[PDB]
Amino acid sequence: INNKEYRLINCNTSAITQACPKVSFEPIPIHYCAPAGF
Amino acid sequence: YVLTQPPSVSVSPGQTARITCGADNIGSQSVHWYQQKSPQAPVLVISADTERPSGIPERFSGSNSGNTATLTISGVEAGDEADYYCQVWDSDSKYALFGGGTRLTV
Amino acid sequence: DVLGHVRMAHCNISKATWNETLGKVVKQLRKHFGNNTIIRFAQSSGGD
Amino acid sequence: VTLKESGPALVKPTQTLTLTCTFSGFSLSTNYMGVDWIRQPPGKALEWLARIYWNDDKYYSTSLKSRLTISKDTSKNQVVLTMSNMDPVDTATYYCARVKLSVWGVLQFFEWSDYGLDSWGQGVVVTV
Amino acid sequence: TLQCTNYAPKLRSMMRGEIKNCSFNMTTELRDKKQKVYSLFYRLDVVQ
Lengths: 38, 106, 48, 128, 48
Ligand SMILES: *[C@@H]1O[C@H](CO)[C@@H](O[C@@H]2O[C@H](CO)[C@@H](O[C@@H]3O[C@H](CO)[C@@H](O)[C@H](O[C@H]4O[C@H](CO)[C@@H](O)[C@H](O)[C@@H]4O)[C@@H]3O)[C@H](O)[C@H]2NC(C)=O)[C@H](O)[C@H]1NC(C)=O
Ligand SMILES: *[C@@H]1O[C@H](CO)[C@@H](O)[C@H](O)[C@H]1NC(C)=O
Ligand SMILES: *[C@@H]1O[C@H](CO)[C@@H](O)[C@H](O)[C@H]1NC(C)=O
Ligand SMILES: *[C@@H]1O[C@H](CO)[C@@H](O)[C@H](O)[C@H]1NC(C)=O
Ligand SMILES: *[C@@H]1O[C@H](CO)[C@@H](O)[C@H](O)[C@H]1NC(C)=O
Ligand SMILES: *[C@@H]1O[C@H](CO)[C@@H](O)[C@H](O)[C@H]1NC(C)=O
Ligand SMILES: *[C@@H]1O[C@H](CO)[C@@H](O)[C@H](O)[C@H]1NC(C)=O
Description:
The structure is cut from a larger assembly and holds three copies of chain A, one copy of chain B (106 residues) and one copy of chain D (128 residues). Chain A is largely without helices or strands.
């Protein structure tokens, strides 16, 4: 900002949401399927 | 509402004179200043506190704040000394109120 | 800050055009109220 | 902008004073300028008497409401001031002056400012 | 709470007292700080 005073980088852009600790980020393969007629 | 002026301001040649005009809440109304020399109608010297009418020397200036309006005349010479008056038009009561005059002395 | 003088917002409506338009409205109202009635326009009553 | 006063020089006690001010260079009910009257007793500060605006508004000093009357005639380009019950204390130089208004907006909304008395007449001296 | 005075005391036009010059603390990006904000409001939006 200007033991020194600091702020988080997001304070100058937007409020920050904490991810739920129970949520895993490991990729899971997703298969895409056509609707009938395609 | 009464406009109170000093009876006189005495200055040296070239020194700035300060002619005041006090009244309760004078800063909320426009104060006009007039200069009377010979026993002839006066000439307007300050219009609405800060405007200098065309033809008036740059020596004439002023301000108005709070309980005091002030006419500042720098560079006073023998040709400037005069009886100066403040006038205010009070829209609330719809009439013009005049002060008692201030005489300059060089 | 407000630059320059503070001024009141307003609308300008031509008087002749309005008077002719209102007269036409009066004629059509007379068709429902009679040829011997009086039609008067007035300001809205007090409220928000 | 020229204003010229005319009236009697000698007034008897209890006599009504009549002062007429003729305008040149401006006129009332055409432009937005007004005219008023001021008096200055000898050796004393200026005393405001009364004002008439371009829109037929009339205002009087609270000290002279019972004695002072003003009227305007725009065909003559004249203003008339009258005062009843003239007293020796009323000896003064009487002046008429133009009340110049600076108009920036709509007149219907009073969008103007009192600019002061930029042009004064020469006045007359009335002794009672 | 706002602390307000008239925007133009001098003005004698119909728009007298309609615009008020108000001061208030409001907030800042950081929870722990405050600032002083001056702004103009119309009379119709501000109640004593
Ligand atoms: C609706 O109709 C009304 C007329 O009934 C109309 O009002 C007019 O508004 C204009 C401004 O929008 C006024 O214009 C002024 O006219 C004077 C003439 O002497 C000029 O001197 C003014 O400008 C000068 O002086 C100012 C003094 O402060 C200076 O700041 C400026 O820079 C110039 O030096 C200005 O031009 C006009 O007088 C009025 N008329 C009346 C009769 O009040 C209104 O604008 C119309 N509105 C719409 C939306 O059509
Ligand atoms: C704050 O955000 C702006 C973008 O809105 C950015 O340009 C600026 O660099 C940021 N401040 C810092 C200290 O990075
Ligand atoms: C409100 O009043 C304050 C008084 O100090 C002044 O500094 C400020 O400029 C005013 N607001 C505006 C918009 O002028
Ligand atoms: C509205 O503005 C137009 C110009 O765009 C003008 O011709 C018209 O006369 C105006 N109306 C009024 C009522 O002044
Ligand atoms: C215009 O208004 C007047 C009332 O002020 C009315 O007598 C006159 O008939 C009106 N003109 C038209 C064309 O409606
Ligand atoms: C008014 O008179 C006309 C004839 O000029 C007639 O046709 C019309 O129906 C009358 N209106 C009413 C409401 O009686
Ligand atoms: C803003 O907060 C400070 C806190 O000390 C207070 O003194 C001040 O009066 C507040 N401003 C307004 C306009 O209430």
